């Protein structure tokens, strides 16, 4: 006899973060083999086509008319925003830094070049 008793395990390749879900920077929204979902707004894409969040926000799945026949995952900076954002409106940006109210810290920062 000779049996075909050999197989790899399942690659855990679902969506790891869902519509309306809060995200943090670095977090993986999708694991996939090839771009089933394309990286949308405020979202990066890795070597393994893994969509990850570039900013803190709300994960949103959407279609964009500019790219028909392509699904997108992006991260809205608030829950208020429809994440296929209006084209000619200005981009919702995050400053994401804090001023150094502390005097010593500010001085150190000024010194550093």
């Amino acid at each position: 006899s000779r049996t075909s008793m050999k197989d790899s395990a399942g690659r855990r390749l679902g969506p790891k973060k869902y519509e309306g879900q809060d995200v943090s920077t670095g977090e993986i929204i999708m694991r996939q083999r090839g771009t089933k979902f394309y990286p949308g707004e405020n979202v990066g894409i890795g070597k393994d086509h893994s969509i990850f969040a570039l900013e803190p926000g709300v994960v949103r799945y959407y279609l964009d008319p500019f790219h028909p026949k392509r699904k997108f995952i992006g991260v809205a900076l608030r829950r208020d925003l429809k994440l296929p954002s209006p084209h000619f409106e200005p981009t919702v940006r995050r400053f994401g830094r804090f001023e150094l109210t502390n005097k010593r810290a500010a001085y150190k920062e000024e010194n550093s070049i």
Binding site: S1, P65, F66
Partner: protein, 195 residues
């Protein structure tokens, strides 16, 4: 010619599966298409082997060949390759070797069809009864006026079921993808896509 022995280039073993109980009301291959009289399954969905089908065909032929311009349309092909282990062997230790070809036959499906120039219906009926004596199901004579079997105890006329243009229906109640495409086609996106 090849209905009882398919010529798949890459011959391969197959899982057992199940005979499809067509819960949605299929009526596909459950209608007289080629001939005047036919033989349909009447019982629960069943597997018919290649050999059995061949024997049924042969039985039918005895009546068909004497006819002027006599014809037999074999409606189903034995597409599923069945392997078997021996009764001699123990359980486990791989899968058995190829044995025969077989077809999964839903409840309502037509198996055969005939039409001669000088074919009286009684003779055809007799032939089909004799064909049925060799097959594992319980079978039924079907004429062009006789209506389509769906369930075990249920019936249907295809003439009744409605005609629909599905593009129009889609337009009426559109999917998200379709809407996105339509938007893309519009000028405020098509001009500024910048490819």
């Amino acid at each position: 010619k090849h209905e009882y022995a398919p010529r798949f280039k890459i011959v391969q073993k197959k899982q057992k599966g199940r005979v499809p109980v067509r819960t949605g009301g299929s009526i596909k291959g459950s209608t007289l298409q080629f001939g005047k009289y036919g033989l349909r399954l009447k019982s629960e969905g069943i597997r018919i082997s290649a050999q059995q089908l061949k024997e049924a065909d042969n039985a039918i032929m005895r009546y068909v060949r004497p006819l002027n311009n006599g014809h037999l349309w074999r409606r189903l092909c034995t597409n599923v390759a069945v392997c078997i282990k021996g009764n001699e062997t123990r359980m486990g230790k791989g899968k058995g070797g190829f044995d025969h070809w077989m077809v999964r036959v839903p409840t309502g499906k037509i198996l055969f069809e005939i039409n001669g120039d000088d074919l009286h219906e009684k003779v055809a009926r007799e032939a089909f009864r004799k064909a049925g004596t060799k097959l594992p199901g319980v079978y039924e004579f079907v004429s062009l006026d006789s209506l389509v079997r769906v369930g075990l105890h249920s019936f249907k006329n295809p003439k009744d079921d409605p005609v629909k243009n599905f593009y129009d229906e889609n337009a009426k109640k559109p999917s998200k993808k379709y809407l996105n495409i339509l938007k893309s086609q519009e000028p405020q996106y098509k001009l500024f896509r910048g490819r």
